[PDB]
Amino acid sequence: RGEYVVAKLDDLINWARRSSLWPMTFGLACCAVEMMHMAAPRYDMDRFGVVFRASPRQSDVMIVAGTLTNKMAPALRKVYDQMPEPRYVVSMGSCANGGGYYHYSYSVVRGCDRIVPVDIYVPGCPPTAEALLYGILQLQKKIKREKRLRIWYRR
Amino acid sequence: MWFEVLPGIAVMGVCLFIPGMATARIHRFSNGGKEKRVAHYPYQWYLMERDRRVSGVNRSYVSKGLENID
Amino acid sequence: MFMINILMLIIPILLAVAFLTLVERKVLGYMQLRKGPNVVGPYGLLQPIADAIKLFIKEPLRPATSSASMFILAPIMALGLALTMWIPLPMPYPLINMNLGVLFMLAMSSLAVYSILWSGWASNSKYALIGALRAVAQTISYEVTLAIILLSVLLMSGSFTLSTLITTQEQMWLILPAWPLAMMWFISTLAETNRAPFDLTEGESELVSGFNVEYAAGPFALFFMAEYANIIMMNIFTAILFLGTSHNPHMPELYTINFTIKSLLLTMSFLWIRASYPRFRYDQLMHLLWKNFLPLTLALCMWHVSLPILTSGIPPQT
Amino acid sequence: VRETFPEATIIKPAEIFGREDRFLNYFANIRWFGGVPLISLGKKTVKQPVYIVDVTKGIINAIKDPDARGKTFAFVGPSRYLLFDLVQYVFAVAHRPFLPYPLPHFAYRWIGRLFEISPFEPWTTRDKVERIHTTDKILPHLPGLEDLGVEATPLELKAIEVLRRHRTYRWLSSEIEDVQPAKTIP
Amino acid sequence: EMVRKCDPHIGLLHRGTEKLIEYKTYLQALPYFDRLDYVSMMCNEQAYSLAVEKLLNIRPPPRAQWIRVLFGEITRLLNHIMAVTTHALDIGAMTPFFWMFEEREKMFEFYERVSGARMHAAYVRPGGVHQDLPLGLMDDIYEFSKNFSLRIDELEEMLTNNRIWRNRTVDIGIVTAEDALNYGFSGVMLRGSGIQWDLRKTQPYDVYDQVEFDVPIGSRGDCYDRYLCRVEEMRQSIRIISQCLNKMPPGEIKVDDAKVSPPKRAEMKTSMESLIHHFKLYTEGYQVPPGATYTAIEAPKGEFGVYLVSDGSSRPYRCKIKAPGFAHLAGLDKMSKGHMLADVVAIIGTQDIVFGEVDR
Amino acid sequence: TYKYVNLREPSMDMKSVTDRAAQTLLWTELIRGLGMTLSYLFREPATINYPFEKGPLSPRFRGEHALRRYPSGEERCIACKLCEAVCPAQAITIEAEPRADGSRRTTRYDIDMTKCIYCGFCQEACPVDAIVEGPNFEFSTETHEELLYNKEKLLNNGDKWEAEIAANIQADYLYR
Amino acid sequence: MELLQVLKRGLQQVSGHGGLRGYLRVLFRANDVRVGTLVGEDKYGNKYYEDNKQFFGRHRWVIYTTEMNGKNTFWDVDGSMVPPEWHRWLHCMTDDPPTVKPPTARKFIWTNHKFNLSGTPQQYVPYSTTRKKIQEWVPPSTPYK
Amino acid sequence: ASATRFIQWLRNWASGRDLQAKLQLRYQEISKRTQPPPKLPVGPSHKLSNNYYCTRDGRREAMPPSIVMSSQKKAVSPAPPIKRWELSQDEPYL
Ligand SMILES: CCCCCCCCCCCCCCCCCC(=O)OC[C@H](COP(=O)(O)OCCN)OC(=O)CCCCCCCCCCCCCCCCC
Ligand code: SF4
Ligand code: SF4
Ligand code: SF4
């Protein structure tokens, strides 16, 4: 039965991908400090298989951790496009979510979702390191629910 | 705790043990239960070639003792 | 049977490399007051499997500006030559018994450098080029001292055959009469494997990812496997050179167990060192080797030519 | 469709070219097989390809245009080309060597089935080969893009946008005016 | 890899903070200062509060002044841990970051217990502080401070005498005392070159004149001396914190003047005057007499000041923020002359730059 | 007062010079650094087992917003708009009118949680403890729209979280 | 010898979880095999434990239920499953568990706690809660003209 | 705190410090997470008499700047020269 085989292969590729999320070493402002605390010993993101890698070529997740300005927007889009696929975007904190404290400024992008597609929004200013971790585990469960091979089988 | 790093070390240790163990056992299997003959110099290869001729079965690891001298 | 012997060499190597990645992450983690992987499989035992699968179903990228053929060739060279470095290793019996096994390992290590130069150059990007030229500097730094350090040790063993080192050290480890050379050998292997505090060709905090910055997915995994394979192999070489294990011909597995423990501990010391020190500047590495090790290595090469002769303890040629 | 929904707007585009098309990208990807097979060497086929943005703007104007209800439009580009001249232009813009050779219809069909075996997205098919070598109909009786206010975009102004990524590093930076256009069937 | 020119292009985190403030009441503008040097949150709040308290011609109560110095010095510990360990992280020593960020995490808890926020407390306000310390907080700060010097001792074991660390930082990025002054440097960027200057000693604020501490001074003006100064400033911060724990006085924690500081919630719900003042302070906000002040503090990164222009209403007319890192980064090209690429990595770290304040 | 951080002349006697030579040749200070990371290997790690274990928080923690009620079930909010006036981010939007019983109550109460800076000014300004920041911090969403809270969402939050919110207010209201 | 006592403690943990099956369940569900004192259990099946000899942060924990509100949570668990009354104790905002210090009862407090519903058909969708502002003129339904 | 005697000795020796006296993990020495209620004091203006606001009004004491010169003897410095700092007696040299 192909349905059974593709279902199990979906679980494997999904499991491999959520178990090995490598965020891009990419942070913008104060939200990036709480992201540092998620890597720090109390939360130890690395224990979930979540490992920062500087090169976009070797990253699976972009965590937009801070305010995105108009001057920075093209560079953020550039390094997101240079991520191979599958790739995911986590929006962290009010600034990245929708502009936040600087929403009405002439120099700020009102939410990073105007520039890139976003999989998870983590609320807070900043979200606590635990809140960000909750967002990463929420991303993992979203990847767990993906049905790439089951949909291909029924195409 | 630190001893939770051991399981990965044990798995890594087992994998590094296999190549040496396998090579030693494969050598005995392919040389009639003995170490593979080592031929670093022409003299040793000459003796091994003579063993192959003397064996009667074209195997330099098949030894012939006094039973073969009349 | 020989084809089976080859497979029972490189498949375990790849498995040991995969689980070394877990061990480094755990060892580094606990030295950093955290745990490292402990979710993906019990105690993180499945973490390497997820990473490998992840990378190989990830999209590989060929950069627009890149030289296509060289870009693909370089990672193949890296892993293929990393595996080649293992075939003459006596554990206690080598897969390929060589007369000049040490000279074979020197040559194969020199050839492997071109997998860094060509990957960096073929990428056609500035951080990759900077990383590649750091490898040129690194090789210039350590290569001369490394060969002459080996020579001094081999003047006590008498040959370039790796199995002879087992005979040489039957009574005593060579680290006793050659601990100064063992110290300089150990640092050179860190520079040879591009390891901290000599991780300059990658130099993450400086070059993002250096020579492999444009590599993704499966091609990236090949460079990673090659590096960790070389870390283990270079520390097996060190164990044979300086901490020789006794070989009982009728119980060869006792050698393997003892020799494996020594190789593991030496590999752990690489992880230990990475956790402890800052990084050299790549000109300071060149001056370390040329202005410190090389003067001392030249003097000790003179001493180890004379010492066998004046003590009447020259090793046998055979 | 015209029976179920009599007031529908039916739009009939020629082959549409754009960044993610299966047209200019399809020809440029023939380069991995060396020469470029063509039925009758592409001298018997004529195409009038239309830019993606033109079709898009035509759809958007049809929504807002009350006159568009119940009509049938034909969206064609400004120029008609011989299939041979079009593919020659594609390889010139991409700076790839162009080695056209003649392949008869039955031979091209046989290879089409070869690629149909793929359970994924076939690189080509028998049906695809047919449509590429079909002449683009001339339909003067139907309204076109100009009837909806869209001014058709020439292929000469947008081919580089689609085909720049098909070049090697040597030719990446070549500018739009470096390649001479294709003969347009007047 | 020789650096022939450094051209910092900033503005990638410019968010028009100074323009936004013109549309806020003085209270509403206070949280913007948490997000400048977003590693020294409560120190930025204190500088803004001192400027407003100066234009208002009011004084915060003694207990609030002691709390401000206590949490100013805890904030200096937060800043120096981030400055030193990321500096080491860039230079390749990744392990101290992890040991010391567990300490940062414990100090984040102190922030959360007084304000309910781990970082952007919005706790220090013109008039005093927002709330009094919860019962039991000072015992836990004391327990933290008892052990912290050992954590500094472990950091120094890894770096201070390490020959690799010294090779990366000794004689790197030398700035002369004269150049440092003309380039507008401040803080450790002056004291590493031997200049004897620290605004807590020379132009003291809330209760810094009542505590005893030593200013560390360098002798070579390079990265290594500036690293030693930051390490010794952490030890002195612990020394100051000890005195604040012992000398904390009783009393109220915001100015007893309900035309500036809001009344207590119980008063607001009983007294007509208190309700009116609560209503007006949270809508129109207190008006500030017209005037202009430049007020500066010894922030962890250097001299942090505000040029605050009041037009007489309840919203500032102009608020110019002087970020110490702005002048420091302008000196990067000067300091990087003759150095290699990896030395520029070290020099960026030795300036201790956060772009929330450089760009605003 | 000041102190010099780096101003010391090494002793030039034979023992000291030979101590420094041993340090240079035998890498003693580098070996000492190895001892420190070794001691950490054998220390219990600081990591907690999230989500089965949680980082500590206090009653003052500022998290997700909620609209509260009196014990009778009546809404506390009487549409004074103090929270909307003080909001540093202009994240609050309010409309009000007389209710069918003449009560002064809101018909709109939106908080744009992507504008909000989670500063707590709104709960300070509220005269009746209607709007609070609760203790929840695990409400990340998959879409932006899910963070634009209207009054129905905020009342549900209050009903959902009131048991914890009331206990937290009880613990801290004497500090306010 | 302590190394022998350590093994007994680790071997005891297998019995403290009711045998190898229960031990392996908690090892694979929570990656932790510690045994604590059962502080209490909520109506959804979550079990709460303390061990005050553990360091602060590790001294309280929850073993989440295997099913909640009709969802299978044997493998899929998340911090939002903790109900509010236990949330305060689990995050150390209070010393007293709700078994000892019960929360005050109100007729409007949710009887059934809901976890994070994002990405499901129960998710929140924003909308304007106000009525139409301008009433438009409606023409008559008869031809008088 | 649960480290065996041998492990305590090992890390004590490697670090060169007695690490058990100043552990970086917190146990029972921390404050209880429930505390008795406070009873905060009031400020100096909480009086029923002799408390007229006009006598304690800081804002209304602010005055416009003093015009020293406008376009409508010994030399001076802005202040006395700064006194030279003293070396610390706690630890003059690090
Ligand atoms: C009978 C008569 C006998 C005659 C023979 C007598 C010979 C013995 C006496 C000679 C001295 C023996 C020791 C020689 C060892 C090599 C010494 C050396 O080169 O190190 C010094 C080197 C100098 O660099 P630096 O300190 O920066 O300053 C130099 C100024 N130009 O500094 C360095 O190299 C620092 C290296 C930095 C990188 C270190 C990272 C790893 C550190 C941990 C390694 C631990 C050692 C492990 C050894 C394991 C071996 C298996
Ligand atoms: S959301 Fe808050 S903490 Fe994050 S970058 Fe913006 S202001 Fe800073
Ligand atoms: S917490 Fe602050 S920003 Fe958020 S709604 Fe309340 S007043 Fe506005
Ligand atoms: S929530 Fe409070 S402050 Fe806001 S309008 Fe309602 S009653 Fe007024």
mmCIF file of C-alpha atoms in Angstrom, chain A residues 41-44 47-48 94 97-98 100-101 103-104 113 118-125 128 130-131 133-135 137-138 142 145, chain F residues 46-51 53-57 61 88-90 112-118 137-145 147:
data_model
loop_
_atom_site.group_PDB
_atom_site.id
_atom_site.type_symbol
_atom_site.label_atom_id
_atom_site.label_comp_id
_atom_site.label_asym_id
_atom_site.label_seq_id
_atom_site.Cartn_x
_atom_site.Cartn_y
_atom_site.Cartn_z
ATOM 1 C CA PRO A 41 22.783 26.937 29.847
ATOM 2 C CA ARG A 42 19.372 27.317 31.515
ATOM 3 C CA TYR A 43 17.507 26.521 28.293
ATOM 4 C CA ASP A 44 20.286 25.020 26.158
ATOM 5 C CA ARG A 47 19.830 20.012 23.531
ATOM 6 C CA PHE A 48 16.850 20.055 21.137
ATOM 7 C CA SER A 94 6.694 43.149 18.646
ATOM 8 C CA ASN A 97 5.771 41.076 14.342
ATOM 9 C CA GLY A 98 4.241 44.389 13.333
ATOM 10 C CA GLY A 100 5.910 47.481 17.799
ATOM 11 C CA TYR A 101 7.082 50.597 19.607
ATOM 12 C CA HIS A 103 5.343 51.131 14.184
ATOM 13 C CA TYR A 104 4.690 54.745 13.172
ATOM 14 C CA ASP A 113 5.967 39.634 7.073
ATOM 15 C CA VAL A 118 6.487 33.939 8.467
ATOM 16 C CA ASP A 119 5.731 30.556 10.033
ATOM 17 C CA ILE A 120 5.536 31.518 13.740
ATOM 18 C CA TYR A 121 5.017 34.836 15.539
ATOM 19 C CA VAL A 122 6.423 35.022 19.079
ATOM 20 C CA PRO A 123 4.759 37.893 20.997
ATOM 21 C CA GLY A 124 6.520 40.005 23.593
ATOM 22 C CA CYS A 125 8.876 42.996 23.899
ATOM 23 C CA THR A 128 11.228 35.759 27.313
ATOM 24 C CA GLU A 130 11.239 30.562 27.402
ATOM 25 C CA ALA A 131 8.639 32.236 25.189
ATOM 26 C CA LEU A 133 11.662 28.329 23.043
ATOM 27 C CA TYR A 134 7.913 27.754 23.092
ATOM 28 C CA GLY A 135 7.883 29.278 19.615
ATOM 29 C CA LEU A 137 8.844 23.917 19.716
ATOM 30 C CA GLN A 138 5.694 25.235 18.055
ATOM 31 C CA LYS A 142 4.238 22.548 12.550
ATOM 32 C CA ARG A 145 2.309 18.033 10.625
ATOM 33 C CA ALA F 46 22.261 24.466 34.884
ATOM 34 C CA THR F 47 19.766 23.311 32.239
ATOM 35 C CA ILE F 48 16.104 22.855 33.139
ATOM 36 C CA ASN F 49 13.839 20.371 31.368
ATOM 37 C CA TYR F 50 11.476 22.669 29.515
ATOM 38 C CA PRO F 51 8.450 22.311 29.033
ATOM 39 C CA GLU F 53 10.116 22.375 34.080
ATOM 40 C CA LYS F 54 9.668 26.134 33.907
ATOM 41 C CA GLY F 55 11.835 29.135 34.635
ATOM 42 C CA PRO F 56 10.810 30.961 37.808
ATOM 43 C CA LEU F 57 8.602 34.032 37.650
ATOM 44 C CA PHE F 61 5.328 39.307 35.538
ATOM 45 C CA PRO F 88 3.249 54.248 24.775
ATOM 46 C CA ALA F 89 2.673 52.239 21.580
ATOM 47 C CA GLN F 90 -0.900 53.385 20.823
ATOM 48 C CA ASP F 112 -2.685 45.180 18.798
ATOM 49 C CA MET F 113 -0.327 42.703 20.444
ATOM 50 C CA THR F 114 2.219 43.312 17.678
ATOM 51 C CA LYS F 115 2.245 47.026 18.546
ATOM 52 C CA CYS F 116 2.224 46.481 22.312
ATOM 53 C CA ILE F 117 5.533 46.750 24.170
ATOM 54 C CA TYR F 118 4.227 44.819 27.210
ATOM 55 C CA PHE F 137 3.708 33.903 27.942
ATOM 56 C CA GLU F 138 3.053 30.850 25.732
ATOM 57 C CA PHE F 139 0.676 32.228 23.108
ATOM 58 C CA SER F 140 2.778 32.344 19.959
ATOM 59 C CA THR F 141 0.631 32.089 16.838
ATOM 60 C CA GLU F 142 0.945 30.889 13.271
ATOM 61 C CA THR F 143 -0.469 34.076 11.718
ATOM 62 C CA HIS F 144 -0.140 37.795 12.350
ATOM 63 C CA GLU F 145 -3.915 38.265 12.479
ATOM 64 C CA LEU F 147 -2.354 38.657 17.610
#
